[PDB]
């Protein structure tokens, strides 16, 4: 396989049933990785993710959680270390969404997504940090961030915010632990081909219209998100730490700018 | 009288009784609007500041409120409403924060870091926008924010995080209302000569290694953000929406690159 | 009379005879400043301006000169101090640009773009800041920039390129010369109502066009512009140094994004 | 080996023969690549690059050209094109820098800086995306940059404008050829352990003023940049494109605010 200091390292992953979470569990089994499978409530694909990691030559457990619930994320990281034996890589990837005019936007909604979002990665990233710190681990933190950390999101102001936030945070931690040897980045999708998109995506004048936001002018593959997951949690990365690297397929440049317009 | 447009202007100011909110409250004073200063805990404090804006030329009310309760921000609006006849401009100043080691910190204190700077300016925001938009006004938002919506904050994640959040949150109601002729921007303080600051700048060397960091040599005076917060508000900066704008005397610039070292 | 402080005050201004920089002249003659006009081909267009500034209240010369030309750049400095006894602010506002693929632009043109946009700009800061140093004044740079130091723009490879470069020469400088008070800003109009856009903005569908993809939903006027030249220049913006402040009705905010599409 | 999608592929590189340079041919001698080495003058170290790739398991040739000479950037790629038979990845690498104060810099020196590092990479990315457009082929293009198109740098504000201007020159030919399925990204360096800095690193307290800018308080091996170099010229970096990938340590998270100063 492809990179090889992956082999038999300790992966949690939340949201990881479904989706880019999904993508990112398969191809660290892929690397014949050691993969923790955090879901909500979705029991059968988190199954069916735990079957598909082993099958591309990977360990895995999988182990229910709501990341917005203190408790679920502290267990969820303790269970990887009392099942595997240890953590390396802490990947925060559970996310909620939906349109509202933000005038609209109630207190609770927002709080869902930011406490989701935001928070949930907070949380993550803390536990990962501790235990690296308490162990002299060189771990590594991968926070699943946006297009939308930079591009402006109308009707998700939510959700904007959250990934702004989300921004500040890595780049902090970043920073604060980087005398460790503990590394901390973002990885920023574009518009993904997955589960919560399916309906649009079928759609032939949605799908069209989303893919005219691409430069590249397709809808990316979850598989390309988890490559650069896979490279930024291998020592290949050893020397990159608070960015964020976008796979958006030339999304953040600014679409509309396409043909020299404005 | 520099900003003539900003005469009789309804401008309400959360934490507008110490610090920048004063500094700010007065400046509006100078420019004869109609200041309403919110306040949490010394009535005494917005009571002396209601003063100097009185004396400055202008009009003041004073109006307790915690901005993490959605009651008291929904009802500081309406009592701008119910006292000055409308709103004008909004401006969210709130903010706390405190030094912990990231991996130490607790959800708690994350929580009331969040809560309070950047949730209490989003429903700010919310509550302000509401009101042009169901009026037809072209008001305006002005979040203070930080040179650390920027540059990361090791010890303060939740300060970090918050302002980062902050930045998406103004850009994308930038953007959702500018069709609206509502604009929303952001000011960048740097080190500035406040209260919160009172502690650290007495002890000498602590002074100086702040204004070793402060490329135009000295820590900022309350009054150069007001103005900077007088420039946005006024029509002035008719074609400015969706910016921060950093009053820092170069901090954003990378204090360890003075004089080439790198 | 609005920046009171800027009467008496000496303004070189490259490009000043038409667009932005016949705006902005005007402009710092209503401030009651002394104006040096630099020019470079319509001598009956920088008369016609040097009458709007002594009308507006203030002083001006036109000189000839080619910002490409070192000596030329040199000159207008001397000149400057020679007729007006000193130097206060200096504006880099000079200005070229024409769509080619980029796989198909030649090297001679690049250069003239890069030459006159950027090392224009280069040339003329470095011979105020000479200015300012051995004089020990707190002097003021004004470099103009555009939406197009952060939006990129295809078919004007040369024209990004070249104030990406100002932004960074201008971050530069305000970090190297702020120990020295001298303040050093950019300003990044986005699509405003100049010479150089007539003919785009006659064409109906054009106009149309241009408008969908500024949030605010008009061109903006020059006087926009040179409202934040006069800010900058102030004492009002003292704290303010090495930034970009964006004029752009919400531009830099991701037209594509409007109403939510992504 | 790691990317099998880079056996056989032709890889240009600009000032390959040392460096940053060296260890990126050489890296992707060991994926098996065929390496085309530029240098300037010294054919020495070229013709033991040239080796070094051969004996990792590489195709190399080498070819004299200053990058500041449009003729030999021209004959580079025509050279590369005859010998190997395609064109896959180009890397404009070449770069000088000398430290002056600003206001002192020379309008020739500034030139070489900039025809060296902005201009060239510019000819270099121009004629590589040319062999790619008029034979259909969806190649790569990387840019060397430097942790300098972000941070600002006093006394060498040539080398800090280059950048800033290879910053938008990518995003832009990344926008403008994403349709075409070439992609074009910046890596930017921090601090490296190369030929032009050994005599600085010999010394002891230079070598810890260094490392005291840099988090992960090492300086950068060049096979940890030449690693980023595979992974965005291979195919896992499939939907990454207009991006500035920093591999500095940490070194643009503002190495002064560790520990939470300021």
């Not at 999904?22 to 735990?50: H, P, S, T």
């Not at 203190?70 to 240890?86: M, R, S, W």
């Not at 430069?215 to 290949?236: D, H, N, R, T, W």
């Amino acid at each position: 396989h492809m990179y090889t200091d992956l082999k038999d390292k300790v992966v949690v992953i939340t949201g990881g049933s479904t989706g880019l979470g999904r993508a990112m569990a398969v191809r660290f089994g892929q690397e014949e990785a050691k993969v923790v499978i955090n879901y909500y409530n979705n029991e059968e694909e988190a199954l069916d993710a735990k079957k598909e990691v082993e099958e591309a030559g990977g360990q895995a457990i999988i182990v229910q959680g709501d990341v917005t619930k203190e408790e679920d994320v502290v267990n969820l990281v303790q269970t990887a270390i009392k099942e595997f034996g240890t953590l390396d890589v802490m990947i925060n990837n559970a996310g909620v969404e939906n349109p509202v005019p933000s005038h609209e936007l109630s207190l609770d909604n927002w709080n869902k997504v930011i406490d989701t979002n935001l928070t949930g990665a907070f949380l993550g990233s803390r536990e990962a940090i501790k235990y690296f710190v308490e162990n002299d681990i060189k771990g590594n933190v991968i926070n699943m961030s946006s297009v939308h950390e930079m591009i402006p999101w109308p009707l998700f102001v939510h959700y904007a915010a959250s990934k702004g936030g989300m921004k500040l945070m890595t780049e902090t931690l970043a920073l604060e632990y980087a005398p460790k040897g503990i590394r901390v980045n973002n990885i920023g999708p574009g518009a993904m081909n997955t589960p919560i998109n399916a309906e649009k995506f079928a759609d032939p004048v949605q799908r069209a219209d989303v893919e005219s936001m691409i430069p590249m002018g397709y809808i990316g593959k979850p598989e390309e998100v988890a490559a650069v997951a896979a490279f930024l949690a291998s020592s290949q990365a050893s020397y990159v730490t608070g960015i964020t690297l976008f796979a958006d397929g030339g999304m953040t440049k600014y679409p509309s700018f396409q043909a020299g317009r404005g």
